[PDB]
Amino acid sequence: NYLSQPRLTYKTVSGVNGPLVILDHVKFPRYAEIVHLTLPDGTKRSGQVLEVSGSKAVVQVFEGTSGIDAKKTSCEFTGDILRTPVSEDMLGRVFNGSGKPIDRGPVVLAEDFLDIMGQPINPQCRIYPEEMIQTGISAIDGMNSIARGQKIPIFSAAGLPHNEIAAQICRQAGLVKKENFAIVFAAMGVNMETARFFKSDFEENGSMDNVCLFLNLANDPTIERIITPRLALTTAEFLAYQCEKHVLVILTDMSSYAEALREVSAAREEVPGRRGFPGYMYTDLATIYERAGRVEGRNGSITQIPILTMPNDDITHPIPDLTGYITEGQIYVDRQLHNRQIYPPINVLPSLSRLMKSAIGEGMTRKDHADVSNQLYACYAIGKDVQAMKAVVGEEALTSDDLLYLEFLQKFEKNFITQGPYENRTVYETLDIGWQLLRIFPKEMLKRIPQSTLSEFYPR
Amino acid sequence: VCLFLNLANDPTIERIITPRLALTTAEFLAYQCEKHVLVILTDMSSYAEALREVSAAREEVPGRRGFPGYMYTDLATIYERAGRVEGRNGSITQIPILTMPNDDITHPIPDLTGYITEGQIYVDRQLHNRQIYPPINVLPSLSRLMKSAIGEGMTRKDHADVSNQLYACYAIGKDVQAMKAVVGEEALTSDDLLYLEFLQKFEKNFITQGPYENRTVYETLDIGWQLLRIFPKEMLKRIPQSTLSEFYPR
Amino acid sequence: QVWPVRQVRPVTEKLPANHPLLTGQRVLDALFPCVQGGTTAIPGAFGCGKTVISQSLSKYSNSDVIIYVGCGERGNEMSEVLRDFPELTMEVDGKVESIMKRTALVANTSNMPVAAREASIYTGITLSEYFRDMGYHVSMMADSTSRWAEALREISGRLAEMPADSGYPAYLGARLASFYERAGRVKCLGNPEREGSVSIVGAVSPPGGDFSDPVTSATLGIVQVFWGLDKKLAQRKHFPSVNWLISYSKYMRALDEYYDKHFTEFVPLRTKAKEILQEEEDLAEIVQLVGKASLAETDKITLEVAKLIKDDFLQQNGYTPYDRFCPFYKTVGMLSNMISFYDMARRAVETTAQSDNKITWSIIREHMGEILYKLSSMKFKDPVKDGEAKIKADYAQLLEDMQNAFRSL
Amino acid sequence: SLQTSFVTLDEAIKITNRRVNAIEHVIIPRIERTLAYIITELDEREREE
Ligand SMILES: Nc1ncnc2c1ncn2[C@@H]1O[C@H](COP(=O)(O)OP(=O)(O)O)[C@@H](O)[C@H]1O
Ligand SMILES: [Mg+2]
């Protein structure tokens, strides 16, 4: 079962416009087919058919359209859609956003060829995730706890330390103890300093033989970003669902991915969505984010941690807004905490985990975990409401109870949220630091906690 | 004098060639006949609105408040037609006049003009309501070329130091006046009452002038020192000790 | 030789940036550092100082070569550099040399052709990479990147393209990001085994002064240093008009090993100064509503020392001989004495406040008006009329004068 | 009793008049400037669309 038929080559380019080449006189054109372009100087580029109509085909070019001409540039149509080679030998390798080697190693000798779009997994064949990942970070493991097979992004902004948060999770993550991760890492549009930081930390942690890197940098072509996450996730699906590994997948700026989609959609002159982004962007992001979880009868999993930069710090922007409707929560990194030199700058109020409710509790972690988590959240919310009042009326207007919330809020940021980049707190250390802060109040104020949990854990 | 007049009842597209006819006349007078020319352009706000009217009718890309996407580049072809050139004895000085819509300096017309011109003189409704004349408010105003048109052999040696200390005292007096509206006079310290006295004397003596009074720079600087001496010399923290010791004791 | 301007000139390797770029400003050099190989943006409203910072950094800095690009800006400013820079000399082997001998300018003024603004940007960085390749440290100035983005918008409009935010083309962010990626510290191509760098400083001109501007908002997603200018500081004649609450540098950890060798006292002083300024910002919101009378004496000290720093450390006139350029010895020395006075004044109040007779900031003011006046006057010492030895000896004498005053309390 | 009342009542009038002034001169104008900016930016989004 091979394409043994010869490839057609055309010199029938009819227009070049932004990332797009248009051809005519093409024989039975195929949607999503791959094309190879040779420029007059002998340079080669690759592209994908975005639209077909009669003998006309529209190609997006992954390496851009500079130096293309309508007379001497020639296009070879490959007869097929984009299938990447895959193997287990891809662990301990470095590739670009096209999946070509950059480590001075050879090209991938395939164990298989997989369609970069994947294949839809039946909802009947998924397993609900309940194994808790201990990330080592108290603001996560205490209050936004992560199940193995979840998708949960870091929502951040320009100038904030989201790369240090992600790298710390890669160092510190493992299961709760009363196995280790393969890592697949995608960079879209990162600076050289970010690419050096992650790569250097995997070399210095000594774990570089259990990671696969795909790197597209801010000087690399924008249109490779369309396929970069899909190459990373097609690699993770082979490792998880054929080689039975547990995979952690990092997609380090979904905002640069969304910007590349807006370049192509604008060049195609389509009807815009919000802020000029494509009207299909929810459906596009869903085909990236839903490639995660566990399947029936296979002993492997994929966990996704995307990362976003919110333009003007606005969570209501289309990129974070659509992402919240697909992912199982978010971790929110806050400029207010960063300007105060708190690290991690995680704001627990807009942060969420949608799968923690079943990953914690008796036999899973400890029986008090839900009660401490709810009561710490409630006190921090009330502490911010007291602080916002106090900033007008001054301290002489506050009650003793308001000063307990204001003391709790200072102590919670200093002890619970502040942690440092190599400190690895267990869930149990996290929960007991939680009780040392709930000790700021008399039991009559701890109203979210049932009397059995108060009686067993408060007096210690 | 040469006059080019388009009135409120004349065609609106003449307004986009009117200032270009004037500036072409100024360039002949300055750079071929070696005159010194003063150019007055009246409501650049009417020019910019006529430009918005034309550009909207062509369905061109909008900028802020619907103005043409290229309006900065257009206004720059008007305002950069000024100055001196090597080997010719003439010059062009431009004084355009703007009406800021709803008094807003952040509106596209004053905004893009302030990015091109070498400063602005700002006329304030609050000074006019108080019947001060001219109603010039120093704080929003600027001259970018002042820094090297003043000082020893140019004007007088104190000029820069006096100017910067008047800016500092006027700005602090204005902050005391805003604070006193919350806390009342009884809460002010004796230092606040100095800046609040300076503020009141400055607007009567320095700013207020009348329409045919014509003061020298030296009269202006000595009115300036009569107001700076309201304070002890230790409060005059913009001025170096050499300038204080020479000019403050008078 | 001849090189295509839209192509990056190759290097053997890109390197971490470890050495400072010195601007001669007290703010910037102390509070918000930059590096050889760095990227910086300077957003501001009109008349904030974007040009004056760019010209001062071009006159007085540790770079070997300066490339100055003026695209979409005034003709009188290119004429200003051509007048000023030939008369101004650095000193080499005990001999003076004009700074124009190390400088090149690219002009395309606000009334020149709009499409040539793009050509100016790529010309300037290609000239900068060519001198980096000789093993030089180059600084490139772009006198407004907003004027290149505005040229992209007119051509995009006349090509009848679909826009992104505020009419700009969808490719604007990729243009900016791939321009700033041409900065860095490098091992050059070829075999004499040398190293060089390009630092890029880009001014930004947000319309109405609004930093939510698409060009500013794209740019701050890229650059590693942000010097945000404030029109309320500029209207007070407070210059450089750098807002110390919003401004930042990402390079402050890279420079740890530099200060830990050359200026081993400095990082504690920098840390204390940021805390005093942040404490004053939290007090000022209370003071504005409550009317100052409720403050503790340590808070009255904090407000007064923040005022001392804001007025006499963070402020320079660039057009006067003593503050044209501030050396890092003068900068560390000034901050050391202001932070020393703070720690002594705070100690005197905090130690005595429990007793029946006790110190207050009002007592310290009446006892120390000469020391307070001397501290405000530290800025007026001239780095070329006075010696390094004379300036450091005077700042040591102020420390003895204030210690003898606090001993007298 | 009248003098302990009078001296305590004088303080509370000053604190109250300071809040009436702060709401009138500081707090309400900041809300009105914010609300005027929002209307201006929503006109921009409508014109872009
Ligand atoms: N550091 C400074 N020292 C003294 N004057 C300054 C300084 N910075 C700015 N100015 C004054 O403010 C004016 C505006 O500065 P400029 O750099 O042209 O503003 P911008 O580029 O932000 O629009 C200058 O021409 C000068 O008069
Ligand atoms: Mg400028």
Side-chain angles (χ1 to χ4, degrees):
Chain A
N1 59 325
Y2 302 145
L3 297 178
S4 55
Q5 231 67 0
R7 294 180 181 177
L8 282 160
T9 307
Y10 306 86
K11 286 182 177 173
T12 62
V13 176
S14 65
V16 191
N17 177 46
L20 312 178
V21 174
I22 300 96
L23 289 112
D24 199 359
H25 313 301
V26 185
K27 309 300 173 62
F28 310 104
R30 172 173 291 194
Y31 174 69
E33 174 171 24
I34 291 295
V35 176
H36 297 302
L37 304 89
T38 308
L39 281 68
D41 60 49
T43 301
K44 286 184 175 180
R45 299 196 202 299
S46 61
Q48 187 163 45
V49 177
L50 288 186
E51 177 186 320
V52 300
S53 184
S55 59
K56 179 187 175 182
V58 180
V59 177
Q60 63 176 353
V61 185
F62 293 127
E63 313 87 347
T65 57
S66 181
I68 296 185
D69 80 292
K71 190 172 179 178
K72 286 189 171 187
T73 301
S74 71
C75 304
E76 177 190 285
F77 278 64
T78 67
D80 201 9
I81 69 180
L82 186 46
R83 302 177 207 274
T84 183
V86 291
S87 60
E88 195 184 358
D89 296 323
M90 295 187 77
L91 294 186
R93 300 298 309 273
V94 196
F95 304 105
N96 71 5
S98 289
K100 297 185 174 184
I102 68 182
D103 53 14
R104 303 172 292 179
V107 293
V108 180
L109 178 65
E111 290 180 55
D112 212 337
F113 297 105
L114 294 183
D115 177 358
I116 71 157
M117 303 304 300
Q119 186 70 32
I121 291 162
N122 187 329
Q124 186 69 355
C125 297
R126 294 181 65 84
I127 301 168
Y128 177 73
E130 287 186 301
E131 306 178 308
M132 179 177 166
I133 301 179
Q134 185 178 257
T135 68
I137 296 176
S138 293
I140 300 178
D141 293 1
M143 298 178 71
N144 303 283
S145 159
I146 296 181
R148 193 158 73 166
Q150 178 161 13
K151 317 96 68 178
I152 182 167
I154 295 161
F155 280 18
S156 192
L160 305 187
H162 44 274
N163 294 333
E164 287 79 2
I165 307 307
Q168 183 167 0
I169 292 165
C170 298
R171 290 189 299 267
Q172 295 185 348
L175 291 182
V176 179
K177 294 184 182 181
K178 192 182 181 182
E179 289 170 15
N180 67 308
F181 292 102
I183 297 168
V184 185
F185 179 89
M188 295 89 72
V190 302
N191 70 355
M192 179 62 75
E193 282 48 63
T194 296
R196 197 189 304 111
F197 168 75
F198 278 103
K199 187 173 181 290
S200 182
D201 195 42
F202 301 135
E203 288 167 21
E204 189 174 336
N205 191 61
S207 62
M208 83 183 299
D209 61 349
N210 220 57
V211 60
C212 193
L213 294 96
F214 301 83
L215 301 179
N216 172 278
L217 273 62
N219 66 326
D220 294 333
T222 62
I223 314 304
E224 294 194 326
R225 300 172 188 163
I226 304 302
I227 64 164
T228 302
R230 291 185 171 88
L231 292 170
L233 290 166
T234 305
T235 306
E237 287 171 346
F238 180 84
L239 295 173
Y241 306 139
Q242 300 185 32
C243 302
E244 295 196 310
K245 302 196 189 293
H246 296 283
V247 191
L248 177 66
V249 184
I250 317 298
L251 307 176
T252 55
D253 198 4
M254 295 304 297
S255 304
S256 76
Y257 177 76
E259 286 161 19
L261 277 174
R262 186 167 65 171
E263 287 169 48
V264 177
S265 182
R268 283 192 68 208
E269 303 162 300
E270 302 181 318
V271 184
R274 292 184 294 157
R275 307 292 293 270
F277 290 100
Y280 49 85
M281 176 158 268
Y282 174 95
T283 304
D284 199 294
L285 292 172
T287 64
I288 292 167
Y289 300 149
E290 299 272 63
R291 295 177 75 179
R294 296 174 67 200
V295 305
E296 191 176 50
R298 311 197 184 185
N299 185 36
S301 68
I302 303 170
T303 305
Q304 282 189 30
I305 301 185
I307 312 177
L308 277 72
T309 280
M310 301 182 290
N312 308 330
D313 311 353
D314 176 23
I315 199 170
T316 72
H317 184 276
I319 303 166
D321 189 36
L322 274 48
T323 296
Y325 303 142
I326 302 157
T327 57
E328 287 116 32
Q330 59 278 328
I331 300 303
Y332 187 103
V333 182
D334 191 348
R335 195 177 304 284
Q336 292 281 6
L337 297 174
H338 184 60
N339 286 355
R340 292 170 178 76
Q341 298 79 31
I342 290 159
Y343 172 91
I346 293 164
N347 192 333
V348 302
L349 298 182
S351 302
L352 179 64
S353 175
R354 295 185 185 260
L355 292 165
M356 82 173 282
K357 67 176 184 175
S358 57
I360 74 184
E362 185 174 11
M364 311 296 292
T365 57
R366 205 169 70 189
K367 65 185 294 190
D368 57 324
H369 193 160
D371 306 340
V372 175
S373 175
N374 289 342
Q375 190 65 56
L376 290 175
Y377 191 106
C379 296
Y380 190 67
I382 295 164
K384 292 298 296 179
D385 289 343
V386 167
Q387 185 182 63
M389 174 190 73
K390 190 269 273 190
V392 178
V393 300
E395 292 84 355
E396 292 77 14
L398 271 64
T399 66
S400 305
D401 299 349
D402 305 318
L403 296 172
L404 294 184
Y405 289 112
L406 195 67
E407 174 168 11
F408 167 84
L409 183 135
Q410 290 181 2
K411 292 282 186 178
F412 177 82
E413 288 177 352
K414 284 179 175 182
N415 296 353
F416 194 84
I417 292 170
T418 305
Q419 178 174 331
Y422 297 89
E423 166 65 333
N424 183 358
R425 294 172 182 167
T426 59
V427 184
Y428 302 104
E429 287 162 299
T430 294
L431 288 177
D432 292 340
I433 298 158
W435 280 108
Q436 292 163 28
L437 295 164
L438 293 180
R439 233 87 75 182
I440 293 171
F441 305 96
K443 292 190 296 181
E444 289 74 15
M445 292 177 75
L446 302 184
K447 295 184 180 180
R448 308 279 83 91
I449 306 189
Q451 288 78 9
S452 306
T453 298
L454 288 173
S455 180
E456 184 164 14
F457 293 94
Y458 183 90
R460 298 186 296 149
Chain B
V1 186
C2 189
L3 291 96
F4 297 88
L5 304 181
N6 174 284
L7 293 126
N9 62 306
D10 291 333
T12 74
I13 308 183
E14 280 190 354
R15 301 179 187 158
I16 65 156
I17 61 168
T18 298
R20 299 193 163 83
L21 292 168
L23 288 167
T24 300
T25 305
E27 283 171 350
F28 180 84
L29 293 176
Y31 308 141
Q32 299 183 39
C33 304
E34 301 195 311
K35 299 197 193 288
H36 301 287
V37 191
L38 182 67
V39 183
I40 314 299
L41 308 179
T42 319
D43 287 313
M44 293 305 302
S45 309
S46 300
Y47 173 90
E49 286 173 26
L51 195 75
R52 183 168 68 169
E53 192 193 0
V54 163
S55 184
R58 298 206 71 242
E59 308 184 323
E60 293 166 351
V61 207
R64 290 172 68 224
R65 309 197 192 185
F67 283 90
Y70 55 81
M71 184 166 78
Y72 174 93
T73 293
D74 195 296
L75 292 174
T77 68
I78 287 174
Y79 303 143
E80 294 288 296
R81 295 176 80 178
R84 298 199 295 162
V85 304
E86 194 260 325
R88 312 194 186 192
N89 197 40
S91 66
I92 304 170
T93 306
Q94 289 196 31
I95 304 185
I97 302 171
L98 277 73
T99 292
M100 304 176 291
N102 302 332
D103 316 345
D104 184 4
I105 199 164
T106 73
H107 182 285
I109 302 165
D111 181 52
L112 301 180
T113 297
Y115 282 121
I116 301 160
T117 53
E118 289 106 26
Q120 62 285 340
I121 292 146
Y122 180 100
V123 187
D124 186 352
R125 192 174 303 281
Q126 295 152 120
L127 290 174
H128 188 58
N129 288 351
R130 290 172 58 214
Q131 308 301 329
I132 286 159
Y133 176 94
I136 293 163
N137 183 335
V138 295
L139 303 180
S141 75
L142 178 65
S143 176
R144 299 190 195 223
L145 300 170
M146 170 169 185
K147 68 194 180 182
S148 65
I150 71 178
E152 180 175 13
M154 297 280 207
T155 57
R156 198 203 258 170
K157 189 175 65 176
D158 58 352
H159 192 165
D161 298 338
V162 172
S163 196
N164 291 336
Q165 193 63 61
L166 292 171
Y167 273 112
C169 299
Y170 191 65
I172 298 165
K174 211 70 185 163
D175 281 350
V176 174
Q177 189 182 48
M179 176 176 63
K180 191 261 277 189
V182 176
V183 303
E185 293 84 354
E186 274 69 20
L188 294 192
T189 189
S190 303
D191 300 348
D192 302 337
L193 299 172
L194 293 178
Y195 296 105
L196 197 64
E197 172 179 345
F198 171 92
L199 179 75
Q200 294 164 3
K201 289 180 173 179
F202 177 88
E203 291 181 346
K204 288 183 182 178
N205 299 344
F206 191 81
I207 302 294
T208 302
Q209 178 166 338
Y212 298 85
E213 176 162 307
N214 182 356
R215 296 172 180 172
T216 70
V217 181
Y218 305 103
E219 286 179 300
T220 296
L221 289 175
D222 289 340
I223 296 159
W225 279 108
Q226 291 160 27
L227 293 161
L228 291 181
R229 284 193 263 266
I230 291 170
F231 305 93
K233 77 185 192 300
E234 294 73 24
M235 293 179 69
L236 304 184
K237 293 190 177 190
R238 303 299 186 112
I239 310 188
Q241 288 78 15
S242 308
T243 298
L244 288 174
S245 186
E246 181 165 9
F247 290 99
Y248 180 88
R250 299 188 296 155
Chain C
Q1 71 180 249
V2 180
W3 187 262
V5 304
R6 297 181 185 277
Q7 298 181 16
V8 185
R9 290 182 58 94
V11 297
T12 295
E13 182 171 39
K14 258 172 181 171
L15 308 174
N18 71 320
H19 193 84
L21 177 68
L22 297 170
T23 68
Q25 307 305 296
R26 289 189 283 266
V27 76
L28 323 189
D29 295 351
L31 278 297
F32 308 115
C34 189
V35 298
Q36 289 186 333
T39 57
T40 306
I42 319 177
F46 64 85
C48 288
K50 299 180 300 302
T51 309
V52 178
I53 291 170
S54 304
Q55 288 183 6
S56 304
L57 201 167
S58 299
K59 283 187 267 194
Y60 320 108
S61 58
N62 57 337
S63 296
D64 300 318
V65 176
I66 304 295
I67 305 300
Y68 199 105
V69 185
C71 69
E73 296 294 329
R74 300 180 186 82
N76 286 333
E77 291 164 8
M78 302 303 281
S79 187
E80 191 174 53
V81 175
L82 291 174
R83 180 178 58 71
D84 194 16
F85 280 37
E87 299 185 350
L88 180 58
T89 58
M90 61 187 284
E91 182 173 24
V92 193
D93 303 321
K95 183 184 182 298
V96 291
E97 299 292 330
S98 295
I99 68 162
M100 195 65 90
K101 283 177 160 59
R102 66 148 199 242
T103 300
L105 297 88
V106 182
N108 196 81
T109 58
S110 57
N111 65 338
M112 286 180 179
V114 70
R117 295 183 187 160
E118 172 154 290
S120 298
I121 289 288
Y122 289 124
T123 297
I125 189 58
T126 304
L127 294 178
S128 304
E129 284 174 344
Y130 175 67
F131 285 106
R132 170 205 74 180
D133 296 348
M134 304 184 198
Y136 290 125
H137 297 290
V138 190
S139 299
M140 185 207 166
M141 313 285 92
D143 214 348
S144 189
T145 56
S146 298
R147 302 280 78 90
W148 171 34
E150 179 206 309
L152 292 179
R153 186 168 67 186
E154 177 163 23
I155 302 302
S156 182
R158 292 186 185 274
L159 292 175
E161 303 183 325
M162 296 298 291
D165 311 75
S166 306
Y168 292 107
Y171 47 86
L172 173 71
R175 293 289 206 271
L176 292 169
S178 61
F179 164 73
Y180 279 107
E181 275 284 294
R182 293 177 78 167
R185 191 174 75 104
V186 312
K187 278 172 166 62
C188 309
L189 274 197
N191 294 295
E193 219 70 79
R194 71 210 176 268
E195 299 189 349
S197 72
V198 183
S199 297
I200 304 173
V201 184
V204 197
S205 304
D210 186 345
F211 290 11
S212 72
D213 159 39
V215 187
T216 300
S217 191
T219 302
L220 299 179
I222 299 153
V223 301
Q224 300 299 295
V225 185
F226 166 48
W227 300 333
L229 306 188
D230 185 3
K231 221 185 206 299
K232 291 194 181 188
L233 296 180
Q235 286 185 1
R236 291 187 172 87
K237 306 301 179 183
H238 184 285
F239 293 118
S241 61
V242 184
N243 182 323
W244 57 85
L245 302 172
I246 74 187
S247 301
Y248 65 78
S249 177
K250 296 274 287 174
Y251 298 118
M252 278 165 45
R253 295 284 71 92
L255 292 169
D256 279 335
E257 176 55 14
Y258 177 82
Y259 299 126
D260 292 345
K261 187 170 185 176
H262 292 284
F263 297 93
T264 71
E265 72 270 53
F266 174 58
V267 169
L269 300 175
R270 192 186 68 200
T271 304
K272 287 177 177 180
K274 286 177 179 274
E275 288 185 326
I276 292 159
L277 295 166
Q278 180 60 92
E279 290 272 38
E280 191 235 25
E281 174 54 21
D282 288 344
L283 290 172
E285 179 175 37
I286 305 304
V287 166
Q288 182 176 28
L289 302 176
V290 181
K292 202 177 292 179
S294 62
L295 294 171
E297 292 303 303
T298 58
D299 300 347
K300 297 191 184 84
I301 288 163
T302 297
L303 281 152
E304 189 64 25
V305 173
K307 176 173 168 58
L308 184 73
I309 291 163
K310 287 162 59 173
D311 295 350
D312 300 311
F313 185 77
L314 298 180
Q315 197 163 211
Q316 278 172 257
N317 190 333
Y319 296 107
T320 199
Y322 51 86
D323 267 353
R324 282 174 183 161
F325 177 72
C326 189
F328 210 61
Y329 77 80
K330 185 180 166 184
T331 307
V332 176
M334 286 178 70
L335 194 61
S336 181
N337 278 7
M338 292 189 180
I339 297 300
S340 176
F341 174 85
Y342 173 83
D343 280 336
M344 293 306 298
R346 182 175 57 87
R347 184 178 182 181
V349 162
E350 182 171 39
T351 303
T352 62
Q354 184 61 12
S355 297
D356 299 337
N357 183 29
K358 60 185 170 182
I359 304 298
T360 63
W361 180 73
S362 55
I363 286 163
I364 295 164
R365 194 197 188 177
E366 290 179 20
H367 183 64
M368 302 192 60
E370 292 77 10
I371 277 59
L372 290 165
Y373 177 74
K374 279 176 166 174
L375 284 166
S376 288
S377 303
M378 287 194 297
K379 69 194 178 184
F380 297 123
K381 300 296 167 71
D382 177 329
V384 295
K385 189 274 293 174
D386 311 309
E388 183 178 2
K390 185 59 169 69
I391 291 185
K392 290 187 294 184
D394 289 353
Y395 295 166
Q397 186 60 52
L398 262 64
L399 182 63
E400 296 185 38
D401 294 353
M402 78 179 74
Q403 282 173 346
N404 289 348
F406 281 109
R407 286 167 179 150
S408 304
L409 297 182
Chain D
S1 306
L2 303 177
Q3 293 191 351
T4 48
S5 299
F6 177 86
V7 177
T8 303
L9 185 60
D10 177 27
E11 171 182 296
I13 290 163
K14 288 189 178 85
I15 295 168
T16 303
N17 286 349
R18 196 169 295 179
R19 289 184 70 181
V20 175
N21 292 345
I23 296 163
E24 181 168 302
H25 293 294
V26 183
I27 300 159
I28 285 170
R30 196 195 299 136
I31 291 163
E32 291 191 325
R33 283 188 292 260
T34 307
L35 187 56
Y37 178 78
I38 294 162
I39 290 171
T40 305
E41 287 297 310
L42 293 175
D43 290 349
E44 293 302 314
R45 299 304 87 72
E46 185 180 77
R47 199 180 307 104
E48 290 178 63
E49 179 173 17

